[PDB]
Amino acid sequence: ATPSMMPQWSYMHISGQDASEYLSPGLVQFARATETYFSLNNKFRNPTVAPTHDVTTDRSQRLTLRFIPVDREDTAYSYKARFTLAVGDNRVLDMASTYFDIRGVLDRGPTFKPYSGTAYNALAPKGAPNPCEWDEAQKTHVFGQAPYSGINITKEGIQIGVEGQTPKYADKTFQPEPQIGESQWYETEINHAAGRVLKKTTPMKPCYGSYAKPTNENGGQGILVKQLESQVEMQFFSTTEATNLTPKVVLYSEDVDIETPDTHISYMPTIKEGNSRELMGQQSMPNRPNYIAFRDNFIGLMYYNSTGNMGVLAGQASQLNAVVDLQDRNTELSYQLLLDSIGDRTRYFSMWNQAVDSYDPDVRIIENHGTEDELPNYCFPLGGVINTETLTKVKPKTNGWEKDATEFSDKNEIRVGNNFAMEINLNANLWRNFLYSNIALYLPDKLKYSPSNVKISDNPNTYDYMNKRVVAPGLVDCYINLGARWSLDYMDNVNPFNHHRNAGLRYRSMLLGNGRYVPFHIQVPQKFFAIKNLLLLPGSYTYEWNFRKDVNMVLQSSLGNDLRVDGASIKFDSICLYATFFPMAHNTASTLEAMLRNDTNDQSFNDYLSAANMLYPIPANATNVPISIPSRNWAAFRGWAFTRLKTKETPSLGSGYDPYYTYSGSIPYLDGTFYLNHTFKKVAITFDSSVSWPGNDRLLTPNEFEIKRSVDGEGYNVAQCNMTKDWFLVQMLANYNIGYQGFYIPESYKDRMYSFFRNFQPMSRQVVDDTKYKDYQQVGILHQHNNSGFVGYLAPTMREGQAYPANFPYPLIGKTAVDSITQKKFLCDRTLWRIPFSSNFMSMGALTDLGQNLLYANSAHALDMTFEVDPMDEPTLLYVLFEVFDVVRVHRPHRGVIETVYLRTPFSAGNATT
Amino acid sequence: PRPPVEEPAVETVSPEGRGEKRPRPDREETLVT
């Protein structure tokens, strides 16, 4: 109301002084003394005031810009989009606000199943057939059902009701509906029933998983044939001993377009084609759930570290590329480990598709508590009782009894004794459904076997192979390692992230949708560290980038199947570069421009991984792995970090297209989902072909880094596992500076997701001893008959057998506990075995004391590291991080000039030869 | 990202932002680091 609002903004403390300034100096001195026991802090209003001038412009200027591609290109294997990243005068652009808005259509292929179970008749039994017809030696047999109860039956069909006096009969296209039957529980008489039965030309499927498309508006499915009229014939049935004749059951025969779009047959009884009686025993099993989606943080779209497909950021005057990418850099993993350190990695950010690959901890490490099934769980009939007998009311005489038929009827359904019931163990069935769906179906393929009478694919990287390999439920049944927190030895070397409980890929698949055909709209971040946080000064810059079209790289399936064979395809419609400018004032952004063009104000960046990446191949079942770095100035060396990979699961980057890479699961090289850490025995590091590192009698075994042991005579293991005491000391000092003043649980901010202690899980179980137990008999999976007559044999099919005392496993408890031996191991996922190049294995700075040592800085030393690993029957890799200082310094001296100097030490990418 | 620091050069860790017992909730008063 007042032209100068300041005298009453200062009075009410809207704009003015802090409470340290407007209060009396004795009250401020009082409130600081009593602050811990009598708070006067919130009793006084403290104003905060935004700056008016020289912060935000008043001119017409956009926050977000839209950059059309100047020069786009669609290869059959990649996509290239070239832009003009024009930063105008008195404007600054942080390249973190820049991203690519990619549109297109994603085809997930026929092998995508985003849900466990089936969509159609899931409550049906798996052996329950449809109402089907067949031929025997030829007569056409009918096995059907007539649930509807009408009024009368003539040759026109069943009478569903009247319209006045005219009998209005059932419309044969959709009536009688297969969902409508009796509503009462007691089996009253139906003299005029009807139902629907599939014809003999319709192929016989089980009810579980059966779908036919509806061919009219009223939902009545049936093949329309041109003459466009449905052929639904009526089939009248009567009593066997009745053959006047009145028909009792009318079955509307029909041809449907029947299909099982999300199930498969787990038991084919007959190899022959055509309908038969034996095909009522075929049993349907749901297909394995396959989550096909873009990777976490959009790994695999963008060509990083492929210098043949290297992107461009250069000014349009010079067009000299300021991006100098390298093949022994890992820009994807440097961005996966960066987001763990500066943020909560458990959270989900849908815009960058930031949903971390995370297995379920019950599935990886089986913590088998048994089942809480002390009470029997019974099912009961519809009216509580079915086997009542007929009795007659009897009144006493005036010993003596006589019939009372005046008030009570002579027929009374009265049950004598307990009612009928059947018993099911519910908690065991929920736990046996858990272990089979999550663990037994994810076993290695050497454990499984081919189904009988089912055509299976020959390519093992096809989903049709992985779906149909039938696995015995007795391998992982509800009694495996009872009371042992023990991951299976079969399941250690199997990727836990290729699973349908991978909650990241579970989230990233549903973020696109549930269908095969997904038109997507994605925002892909920039990960190259020199241009990831770069603040561009004004100028005209070209900004060119290569995108992948490889469906084994841009997509992630939860089984790891070859998505090129499995019909997955991606098509890019258009890509737009967006860039959000801060609306800075044109004199402030001219001062900031002029300050940041000095050669002392150069923006310098560092890759978060900061490592040289060397994949050393390991042959199949090869225990010893010798590597060799020939000769180098080892100045500014930080340390090592290593993890075994798989050659099947790791693509050779630098190649723009690998036609022999038949895998679309989690790539541990790119996302940080490392899981083969436990397969290391020892590391022997010897500098200069003579000097063992660290030397100095540092370790209890001073010549090498013993990571784990089988033979432990001298007693050097930690954590009730087989990890040694030297190696647990190093790994707690490398990550946490913990170990010289006692081992303790590190703080929650140092113990991130990809760290050691978050993921180190020690385990122990007891198995039977074949050397001490006297009555030991090796019983294979063919002859183990626990749950003998209540469980299907070697199959998820129907039960078979008799009730009988089990023979497997041997009891480890009780008075008859067998002679048992302890097997110890550990699993430590998601992490890299860090060995820091420090004289006390501690992090006292990023540039360590041995990297500054005059031994390694003024001389050239050889390096001969000798890894010893567990044998694996698969060609595996070895991913050693040679930790360096991958540092860029960026100079922009004039408008549109972008000069960068890259340098990493020791493993530099430029010497006098280049 | 970095704990608070005084500059007496030498570089001295500052004790501000640490947790204390307070009769009133500490988020409405201070920033707790």
Partner: peptide
């Protein structure tokens, strides 16, 4: 202390 600014909705 007394220098901490007052809690308001959105600023």
């Amino acid at each position: 202390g007394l220098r901490f600014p007052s809690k308001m909705f959105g600023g």
